[PDB]
């Protein structure tokens, strides 16, 4: 019953079309609970889960402060990085940041993270010790030397082992009814002939939470990938997830195939057969 809290920030330059766009989102496990969008009219951090709505004006003000500050920081950093990479002023570029913390079933700190990208590639990352950085390239080594001189790892560590964990605990308590729930998958199979010699079997998992799931097709008790398709797990839109896995089988051999479903909400893994 480990839990995580994660923030995801994206800044995108749009030369000649206004200031960069900045978006922030926060999650507890697979549930979003806040957002900020620099293009929205409110200019505030806004709730997106029912259990955060009880937070008071001080909280909303402070959260809004923090993300506004990051948006402005990123406007400087976009300029800096364009210079490090010798890029023109006319192209759009992206900075992404993810950070957060994981707690155990006891609610104690397990791990913290902070990692940064540029144009969808690793740029710099805080190491697991929360004391040192890994730079992905020579431009990020410039940043790394600045950040060592600034003692930036200590400020990140203090947050990740402190405030991060404390607030993750609070949210887990306040949103307990939904955050600490598991919703097992509701499963079914579909079957469609595709020719006079093949048919498709598709194994469905619907309505599950958290998102982590495994679906596996077997023939004669052996996991298979020949003639299989597995889609990315996808949001239902109501806070639960969906996934399917399909296999093309020789007509008349459907009964040799089984779909195995693994999910935390299941007492034991399910075996489905047509």
């Amino acid at each position: 019953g480990s839990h995580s809290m994660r923030y995801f920030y994206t800044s995108v330059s749009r030369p000649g079309r206004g200031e960069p766009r900045f978006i922030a989102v926060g999650y507890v496990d697979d549930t979003q609970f806040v957002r900020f969008d620099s293009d929205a009219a409110s200019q505030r951090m806004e709730p997106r889960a029912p259990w955060i709505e009880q937070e008071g004006p001080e909280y909303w003000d402070q959260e809004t402060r923090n993300v506004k500050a990051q948006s402005q920081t990123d406007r400087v950093d976009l300029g800096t990085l364009r210079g490090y990479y010798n890029q023109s002023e006319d192209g759009s570029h992206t900075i992404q940041i993810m950070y957060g913390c994981d707690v155990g079933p006891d609610g104690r700190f397990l791990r913290g993270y902070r990692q940064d990208a540029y144009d969808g590639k690793d740029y710099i990352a805080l190491n697991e010790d929360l004391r040192s950085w890994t730079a992905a390239d020579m431009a990020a080594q410039i940043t790394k030397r600045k950040w060592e001189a600034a003692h930036a790892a200590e400020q990140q560590r203090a947050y990740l082992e402190g405030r991060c964990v404390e607030w993750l605990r609070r949210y887990l308590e306040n949103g307990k009814e939904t955050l600490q729930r598991t919703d097992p998958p509701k499963t079914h199979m579909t079957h469609h002939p595709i020719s006079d010699h093949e048919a498709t079997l598709r194994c469905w998992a619907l309505g599950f939470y958290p998102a982590e799931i495994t679906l596996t097709w077997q023939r004669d008790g052996e996991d298979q990938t020949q003639d299989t398709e597995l889609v990315e797990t996808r949001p239902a839109g109501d806070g639960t997830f969906q996934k399917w896995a399909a296999v093309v089988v020789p007509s008349g051999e459907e009964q040799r195939y089984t779909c195995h479903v693994q999910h935390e909400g299941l007492p034991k893994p399910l075996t489905l057969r047509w």
Binding site: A24, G26, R65, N66, V67, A69, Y99, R163
Partner: peptide
């Protein structure tokens, strides 16, 4: 709660 505070 975000870093910054």
């Amino acid at each position: 709660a975000t870093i910054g505070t």
